[PDB]
Amino acid sequence: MFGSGNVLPVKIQPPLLRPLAYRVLSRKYGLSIKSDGLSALAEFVGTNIGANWRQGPATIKFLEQFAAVWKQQERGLFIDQSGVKEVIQEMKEREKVEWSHEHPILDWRDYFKVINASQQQRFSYNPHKMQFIFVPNKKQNGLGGIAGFLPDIEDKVQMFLTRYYLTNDRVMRNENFQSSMSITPIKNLLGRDAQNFLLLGLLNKNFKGNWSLEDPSGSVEIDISQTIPTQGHYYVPGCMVLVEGIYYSVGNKFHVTSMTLPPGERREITLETIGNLDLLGIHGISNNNFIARLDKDLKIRLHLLEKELTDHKFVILGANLFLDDLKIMTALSKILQKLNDDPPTLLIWQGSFTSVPVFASMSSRNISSSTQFKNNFDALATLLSRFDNLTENTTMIFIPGPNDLWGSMVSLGASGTLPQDPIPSAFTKKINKVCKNVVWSSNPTRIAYLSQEIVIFRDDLSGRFKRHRLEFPFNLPQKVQETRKLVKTILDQGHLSPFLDSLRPISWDLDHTLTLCPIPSTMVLCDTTSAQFDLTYNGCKVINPGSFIHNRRARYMEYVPSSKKTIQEEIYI
Amino acid sequence: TWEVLQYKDSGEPGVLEVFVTINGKVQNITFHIPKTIYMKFKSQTMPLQKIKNCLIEKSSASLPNNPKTSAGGQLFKITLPESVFLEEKENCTSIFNDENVLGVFEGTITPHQRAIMDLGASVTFRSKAMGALGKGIQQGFEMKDLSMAENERYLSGFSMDIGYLLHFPTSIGYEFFSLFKSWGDTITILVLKPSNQAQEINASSLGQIYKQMFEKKKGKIETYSYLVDIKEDINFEFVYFTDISKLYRRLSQETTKLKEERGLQFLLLLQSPFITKLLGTIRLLNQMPIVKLSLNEVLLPQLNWQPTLLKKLVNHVLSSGSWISHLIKLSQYSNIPICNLRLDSMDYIIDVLYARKLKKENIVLWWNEKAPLPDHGGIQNDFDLNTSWIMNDSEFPKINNSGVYDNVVLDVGVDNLTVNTILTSALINDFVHDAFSNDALNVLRGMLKEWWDEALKENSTADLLVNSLASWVQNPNAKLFDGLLRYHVHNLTKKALLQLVNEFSALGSTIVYADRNQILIKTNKYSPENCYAYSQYMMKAVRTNPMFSYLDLNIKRYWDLLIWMDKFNFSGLACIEIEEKENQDYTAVSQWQLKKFLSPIYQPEFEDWMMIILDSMLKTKQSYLKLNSGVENSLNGFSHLFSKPLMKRVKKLFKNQQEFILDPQYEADYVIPVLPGSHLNVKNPLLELVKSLCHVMLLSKSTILEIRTLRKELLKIFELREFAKVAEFKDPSLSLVVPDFLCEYCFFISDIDFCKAAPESIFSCVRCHKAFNQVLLQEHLIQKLRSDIESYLIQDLRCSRCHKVKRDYMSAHCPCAGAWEGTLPRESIVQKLNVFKQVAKYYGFDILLSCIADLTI
Ligand SMILES: [Zn+2]
Numbered sequence A: 001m002f003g004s005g006n007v008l009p010v011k012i013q014p015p016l017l018r019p020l021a022y023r024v025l026s027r028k029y030g031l032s033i034k035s036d037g038l039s040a041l042a043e044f045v046g047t048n049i050g051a052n053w054r055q056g057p058a059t060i061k062f063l064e065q066f067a068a069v070w071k072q073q074e075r076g077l078f079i080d081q082s083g084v085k086e087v088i089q090e091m092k093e094r095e096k097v098e099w100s101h102e103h104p105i106l107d108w109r110d111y112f113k114v115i116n117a118s119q120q121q122r123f124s125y126n127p128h129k130m131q132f133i134f135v136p137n138k139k140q141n142g143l144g145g146i147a148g149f150l151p152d153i154e155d156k157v158q159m160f161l162t163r164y165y166l167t168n169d170r171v172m173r174n175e176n177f178q179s180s181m182s183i184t185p186i187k188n189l190l191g192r193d194a195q196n197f198l199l200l201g202l203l204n205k206n207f208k209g210n211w212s213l214e215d216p217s218g219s220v221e222i223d224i225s226q227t228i229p230t231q232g233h234y235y236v237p238g239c240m241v242l243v244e245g246i247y248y249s250v251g252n253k254f255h256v257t258s259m260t261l262p263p264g265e266r267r268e269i270t271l272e273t274i275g276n277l278d279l280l281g282i283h284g285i286s287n288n289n290f291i292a293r294l295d296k297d298l299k300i301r302l303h304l305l306e307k308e309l310t311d312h313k314f315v316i317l318g319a320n321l322f323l324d325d326l327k328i329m330t331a332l333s334k335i336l337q338k339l340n341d342d343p344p345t346l347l348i349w350q351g352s353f354t355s356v357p358v359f360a361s362m363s364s365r366n367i368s369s370s371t372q373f374k375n376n377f378d379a380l381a382t383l384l385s386r387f388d389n390l391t392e393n394t395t396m397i398f399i400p401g402p403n404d405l406w407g408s409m410v411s412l413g414a415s416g417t418l419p420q421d422p423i424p425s426a427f428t429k430k431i432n433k434v435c436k437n438v439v440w441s442s443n444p445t446r447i448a449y450l451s452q453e454i455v456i457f458r459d460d461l462s463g464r465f466k467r468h469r470l471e472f473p474f475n476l477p478q479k480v481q482e483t484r485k486l487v488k489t490i491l492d493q494g495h496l497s498p499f500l501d502s503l504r505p506i507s508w509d510l511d512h513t514l515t516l517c518p519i520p521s522t523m524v525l526c527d528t529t530s531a532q533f534d535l536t537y538n539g540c541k542v543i544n545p546g547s548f549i550h551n552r553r554a555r556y557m558e559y560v561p562s563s564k565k566t567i568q569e570e571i572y573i
Numbered sequence B: 001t002w003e004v005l006q007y008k009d010s011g012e013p014g015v016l017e018v019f020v021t022i023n024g025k026v027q028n029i030t031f032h033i034p035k036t037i038y039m040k041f042k043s044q045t046m047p048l049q050k051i052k053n054c055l056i057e058k059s060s061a062s063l064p065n066n067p068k069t070s071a072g073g074q075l076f077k078i079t080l081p082e083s084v085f086l087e088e089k090e091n092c093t094s095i096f097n098d099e100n101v102l103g104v105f106e107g108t109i110t111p112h113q114r115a116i117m118d119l120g121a122s123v124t125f126r127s128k129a130m131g132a133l134g135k136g137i138q139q140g141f142e143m144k145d146l147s148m149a150e151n152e153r154y155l156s157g158f159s160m161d162i163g164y165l166l167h168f169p170t171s172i173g174y175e176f177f178s179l180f181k182s183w184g185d186t187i188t189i190l191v192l193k194p195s196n197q198a199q200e201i202n203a204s205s206l207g208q209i210y211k212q213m214f215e216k217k218k219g220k221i222e223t224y225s226y227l228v229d230i231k232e233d234i235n236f237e238f239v240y241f242t243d244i245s246k247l248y249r250r251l252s253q254e255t256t257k258l259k260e261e262r263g264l265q266f267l268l269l270l271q272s273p274f275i276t277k278l279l280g281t282i283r284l285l286n287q288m289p290i291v292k293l294s295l296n297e298v299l300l301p302q303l304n305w306q307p308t309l310l311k312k313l314v315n316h317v318l319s320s321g322s323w324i325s326h327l328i329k330l331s332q333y334s335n336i337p338i339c340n341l342r343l344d345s346m347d348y349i350i351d352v353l354y355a356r357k358l359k360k361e362n363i364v365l366w367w368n369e370k371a372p373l374p375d376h377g378g379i380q381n382d383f384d385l386n387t388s389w390i391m392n393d394s395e396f397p398k399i400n401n402s403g404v405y406d407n408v409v410l411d412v413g414v415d416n417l418t419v420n421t422i423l424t425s426a427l428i429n430d431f432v433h434d435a436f437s438n439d440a441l442n443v444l445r446g447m448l449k450e451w452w453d454e455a456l457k458e459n460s461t462a463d464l465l466v467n468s469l470a471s472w473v474q475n476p477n478a479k480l481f482d483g484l485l486r487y488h489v490h491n492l493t494k495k496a497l498l499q500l501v502n503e504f505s506a507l508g509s510t511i512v513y514a515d516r517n518q519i520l521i522k523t524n525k526y527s528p529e530n531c532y533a534y535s536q537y538m539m540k541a542v543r544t545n546p547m548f549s550y551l552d553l554n555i556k557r558y559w560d561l562l563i564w565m566d567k568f569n570f571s572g573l574a575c576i577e578i579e580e581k582e583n584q585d586y587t588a589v590s591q592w593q594l595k596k597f598l599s600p601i602y603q604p605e606f607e608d609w610m611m612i613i614l615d616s617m618l619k620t621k622q623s624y625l626k627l628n629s630g631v632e633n634s635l636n637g638f639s640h641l642f643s644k645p646l647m648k649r650v651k652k653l654f655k656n657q658q659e660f661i662l663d664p665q666y667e668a669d670y671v672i673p674v675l676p677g678s679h680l681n682v683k684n685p686l687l688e689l690v691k692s693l694c695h696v697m698l699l700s701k702s703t704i705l706e707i708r709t710l711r712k713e714l715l716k717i718f719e720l721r722e723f724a725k726v727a728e729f730k731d732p733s734l735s736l737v738v739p740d741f742l743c744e745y746c747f748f749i750s751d752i753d754f755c756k757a758a759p760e761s762i763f764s765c766v767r768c769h770k771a772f773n774q775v776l777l778q779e780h781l782i783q784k785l786r787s788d789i790e791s792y793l794i795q796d797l798r799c800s801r802c803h804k805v806k807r808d809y810m811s812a813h814c815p816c817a818g819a820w821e822g823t824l825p826r827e828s829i830v831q832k833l834n835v836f837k838q839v840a841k842y843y844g845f846d847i848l849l850s851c852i853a854d855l856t857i
């Protein structure tokens, strides 16, 4: 940390700091000093130095370092007391790194954070400005009724065009289209009789019931008689696909020769295209005037200390675990005892916590279904009280399932709004009296572990993908093949759930969380309709446990991020 | 014969433990039943390469038509045992994990409920080809060995003792166990206490409680005392604990000694809120055949609860026998085992009898146990706007006609409206994606015709079914809750109510209000003494109608002179029964919720002036009727009787208003109250009172000119114009309604309005006057809030000029070049959420406050 001070701290004042305030940093470096920031600086110089603050060169060097650090961030032309607190904490981290550099011998909790779908910063693409632009959150602005769950009426219009121009950028950046053909907007096609064209289009079924491709300039009807699709992919309505074929002006139809998805791009390619924007906000937060920049040396240092920390493990349970079943309770007790042998870093708990959906019943004599949910969480807290190591050393993350209390109150266990909110805090307070650090997050959960961005998602993807797949007239282990098809489709979209709004709705204000234009290094799709798998593709890791029980066995994972390795372990129940 | 007591779930796939009786001996036999599913394929070809011990056949039955699929394949019926079903469940090369799968109908059916449906309460075996019955005894019985039997012989009489066990949870945190022995002479009570300092010993008081209820229930036990119990005079035993861990072991010993007392020939009446946790904690009850009743949580005070709880214990002990005999009478007709049917939930017998007739008529069930959604082939849990629209929208369109009425306004109560609607579906109608399957509704219509015909023979079971079908349809807890079915019944109920309005209008009677129960109409007569025979002729003429022949229409109240705003704001003069009296035993009813949005000094003056208005209106109507008999109504010119005192009273009240509004001594009478419906802000309380009085006087369609001149003269003293912005009236209560909230006691399905109703009539039933628990009210407000939020998020966008729906899903603007606006307003949802926040802050729904807290964050 800091150098050791021999004498005791004293409480020096903003008086007699007056010559040692404006000359040293406000004239040499040009930063205006407010009263509260000057008081905080006087307090911290007092605690660092003591009685030798009048004749100490360390005060002058520390103020020069303060002005220099405020010059790299440029968080403001003024000096704020909260800003002094952030700069002081970053300096404590900075000289901790420098002390580790002096003698080769930080903390992981200083940089690890959890971001829900509501807490994520908003970004939107503009090809009239040709790049990204950040939108400040409106949750603080206005009334909480207006801010919470009431998005603007234009955002439904803007959502799929934003996804379109993101997909257009990701396909224009690829070497294949900087070569083969070029993309023409759909509105230009009508009039060009019998000429070959290549398109990017939102695939849709129109009011007539035929297949169509749509762009912000319009739409055209297509027919899929002559298609030769690319093997290894999934095609569902709502896909934005590359379509090559010939338009005919007789019946206003487009005859498709071949169809494919746009090719993916790696994570570092996306970050160098955007210019290393800190999208999650690992260093401060992005404001309106200044956008937060991820430092390259900071990223290298976090990668180095990530490779230094090798004992950290991520234990992932299988999803769809029912708290009301006694066999699941016994199996959870055994596997939590096995985790009580050695506590991990994070224990991400997920799945549909109750077997039945929680609905407004008409049995007033019996305990209600929400009361059953509360009693099940109290029994879970009673089991967690038996194990001190997990509640002392391991933080836990709670991901909602499709059948939890909060989202499926009106959906009744069905598909609902895609950004499913976390489990209510009033229904689980005893868990907060047991665990030292527990985070109840949304269904798309973006956790930042050092230099790693991890996305957690719980959805039955493969059943919906297989049910609404595009059937054609003209058209190797099976589980592995379908696994590669699912992961390649999801990463080539750059979206968690690329379905239409009729298939699965998305709340309008928070779609950027579900938009996966920055491809994460490792995400965990949790699909009980698919088998367990682990693959890497395009610089991304996609892992999947499926259901919690599979033929009298409880399945869990130990994922180390340092060597990027996952061990699949099953427990015979 | 083999009459069956209990079908019992077991840990083995496809194996269930069955308790029957032979010669009064309770026999336990393991039973093996394969599961039958229905499979929808992409093509007509069957790939069946080698599947071990499975029957695959073609099936000719149509499917439940969910709107997203309404191709070139065929339905197939497949029967296979559940264990080997699990053997090809794990194989991905099997047909169950095929990629040519369209749907898997009835894949979640348990062997237990399948044995309930298929085999009935009366089963017989076949011995035309059987090597050894004992080999069938330990090796189990298959369904090809069995068939149905006679229903009347099932439980004609049993010489078998009951074992009666209850768990009591109290509001103060106490826990009670009680054990009864009919063969013994002991009633045993285990009591938990938090500390030994708390005192609950009442052995002599329990004896006095028994002596109090002895003469009280001697006349009630004796109806069934010759069958259910031998000696009602038994002795009391008690034991006390300060903990719960050894209490399970004590209960285990005291229930294990029953097994050596009788020897596996008795059933247990178990009443505990927790069942699965109970059977996890104690073991010998799980093998024991159990009849079950879920028990309401006992709510008791801190002190003097002890005689109340001992009274309750003696009441259940002495009232068990009539419940047991009612189980026998229910099981005689229902053809369901006595242990497996739930008496407490009447929808189970409805579901199984319905599904029996569905399986008789060769049509695939949507029987789903552990979810309110149907099966629909397993392609459920996918969002569609069709099912969200037909499952979300629960709204009953009331027909409201405000005004003053001098005819004899009739109140008729409509009973069995849903039953008469769904029973006469073939007369109301005299490829659709949102339509229920027609043949299943013909099945239900014929079944309800059979139930109604059996109800006229005073079958109380069938009476309970025909009174419980309307609650079965609305309930998602039932196995066959289909949203298309409920929407079909709700739309037909709307059609039947509108046809009832048209039929009452075809007899020269205009309605005032229409609802599910209460209907207020306006006749052509002026006095009820001339209107009684005409009302009887009208109600018998509408009972003559073929579309309405099962409708229980009963007159509730005669209204002579009525003012109508809605059901929550009405005043006038009424009589319950017609009598030969000069005064006719008339009474005055004033039920203004408008009065509550006023200052407390100004509240009784509103009722005073309403009484003056009513008395002047009766006097004017009587004078006009006597003068004329010997478009405007009889009420013209009534305000000449009392405008002269009212102007002076308003001026005196104005003089009192300009003195004491700002004085801090009298300001407490001048405050505005905060109510959950209130959204407006008052500026002058006397202005609001004058507006309310002139608006209730302004409801008259005939003398609106004279009332307008009176309002013009009254608004001059406040120095306001005739048509000012603040002078016009708005309703000070924003309508918050929850649709179709029914009590479990009298099954009255009503819509509860949380803003415009009194707090006394909200938490309890309207007719039964039995208090609802607040938890399900909170749950229904959560459901209504998320329904409104979901209706905001799934939303068509319309043009500002063309008013055309958005066909191309993503575009800048319409070809008419208008902007896209929501079908729902931007401010409507936030006013709904603000009224939800206000009603949560008023009525103290802490779960709803927490929901707003997590919604804002
Ligand atoms: Zn009631």
Ligand SMILES: [Zn+2]
Pocket (backbone or CB within 6 Å): B799, B800, B801, B802, B803, B804, B814, B815, B816, B817, B818
């Ligand atoms: Zn237009």
